[PDB]
Amino acid sequence: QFVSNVSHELRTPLTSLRSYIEALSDGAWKDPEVAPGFLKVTQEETDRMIRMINELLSRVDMELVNINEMFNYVLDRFDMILKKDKYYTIKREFTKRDLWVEIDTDKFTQVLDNIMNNAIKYSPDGGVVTCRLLETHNQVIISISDQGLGIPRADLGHVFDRFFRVDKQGGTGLGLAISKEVVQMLGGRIWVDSVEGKGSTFYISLPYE
Amino acid sequence: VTEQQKIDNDRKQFVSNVSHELRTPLTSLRSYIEALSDGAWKDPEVAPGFLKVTQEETDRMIRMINELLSLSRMDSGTTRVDMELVNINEMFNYVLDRFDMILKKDNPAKYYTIKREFTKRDLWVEIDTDKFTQVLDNIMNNAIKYSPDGGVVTCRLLETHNQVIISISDQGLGIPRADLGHVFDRFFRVDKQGGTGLGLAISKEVVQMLGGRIWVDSVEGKGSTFYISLPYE
Ligand SMILES: Nc1ncnc2c1ncn2[C@@H]1O[C@H](COP(=O)(O)OP(=O)(O)O)[C@@H](O)[C@H]1O
């Protein structure tokens, strides 16, 4: 059913949560410098998941947001996923400008979640996931590069098809189909370049003003 | 008519239940977190206790989405199976061993003994070892959870010309005869944290996928017996 979809999308926020709670429980609660901030995040994520379940049991909600530190926030949650508990670095290279863009926040945060999952999951044996936020031509470009298993150039098309998975562990293959679905739904475009064994780079373009 | 309709109706109530059964731990979660954010975290006497409850609830929903995902995969037919000839006897024995050894490492809340009564023949049978061992696991888990203290889980591996039978017997409080049909339905729980109401549902699904058939006999106040039947030669 469409149940399979909520099943899939709750995965990464459940992870974010379990990861943060485990951090607080492992002592961070005693630390006044951080424990509140973590609590705000666990709160925000729980509320996110509730919204998610409600919209999918019973539309887009476009609002203007500051893409820069939304992307920073998502990346923060993953930084905390990769801590606690191969080594991965999230190398961030954003423009210093604050690019504002019309999007659905929960849907788009789901997109970034899937693509960081991909960049990380198909990167065993370590890696450096490199995240770039820039703009040209009234478009806002996000790129995510990993030193993963790459993609055979034959399949570079099919990675956005439903259930389509490469040969080589895990998943139903609806991550990138949902991602493409959402990105096109927001008036933007998504694509991938990749070199088998080298790594990969995922791109999203969104209209700017 | 009622053909297509039973299908669509079952589907829509399953969606309604997934909505609720997912949403409810999220709600509980929200309440504890919100409590912690509103000061409880500064309090050493309560903050750990709350953090454990929130940890556990989160783990619960994770297991649930794993099971709702394997269930989607099985309805879809996406669920690939690998039938291979394996030794049912020592597979069932290895399962029982893992359970014996969890309780052999102590101190335990409740105490149970696993009584094994197997046929002496070495039954070789084509099955997917991993999915079927998951089945045996849910049913043993179940057998254990609804057991009294000192209870005896009675596990039988036997055979008939036509069949290979596994039974898992518990001395729990049994199942109302109204509900004997419903015990394998999704999210169906008798009363009841501790787990998702998808254990037995997955079990029945997997067993039918492996070509066998699964059912329950039970007497209120006495206990229960779960049966798995597999085709033999
Ligand atoms: N960095 C990456 N490197 C190599 N392959 C990738 C990468 N990201 C996505 N893919 C490919 O996309 C396929 C399916 O993607 P996805 O929808 O995310 O599946 P899943 O259900 O596991 O989440 C995968 O088989 C994978 O090979």
Author numbering:
A (entry chain B): 384 to 441, 451 to 477, 482 to 564, 570 to 610
B (entry chain A): 372 to 477, 479 to 564, 570 to 610
Provide passages from the article that reported this PDB entry:
A typical TCS is composed of a sensor histidine kinase (SK) and a cognate response regulator (RR), which are encoded by genes that are often clustered in the genome. Modulated by stimulating signals, an SK first performs an autokinase activity and phosphorylates a conserved histidine in its DHp domain. Here, we sought to determine the crystal structures of a WalK homologue, lpWalK from Lactobacillus plantarum, which shares 60% sequence identity in the DHp and CA domains to our previous solved smVicK structure, in different conformations in the presence of ATP analogues or ADP. The catalytic region of lpWalK contains one DHp domain (amino acids 370–450) and one CA domain (amino acids 450–624).
However, the overall structure showed the same conformation as lpWalK co-crystallized with AMPPCP. Interestingly, the interaction between Lys476 and Ala406 in lpWalK is not found in smVicK as Lys476 is substituted by Gln301. Together, our data indicate that WalK adopts a closed structure in the presence of ATP analogues or ADP, which is characterized by the asymmetric positioning of the two CA domains; only one monomer of the dimer switches to a closed conformation while the other one remains open. The adenine plane of ADP is sandwiched by Tyr518 from the N box on one side and by Ile547 from the G1 box and Phe603 from β7 on the other, and is further fixed by a hydrogen bond between Asp542 and the amine at adenine C6. The α-phosphate (αP) forms hydrogen bonds to the amine of Asn514 and the main chain of residues 574–577 from the G2 box. The β-phosphate (βP) forms hydrogen bonds to Gly572 and Thr573 from the G2 box. ATP/ADP fits into the active site of the CA domain through extensive interactions involving the N box and the G1 and G2 loops. In agreement with these results, a recent report has indicated that ADP rather than AMP is an efficient VicK kinase inhibitor.
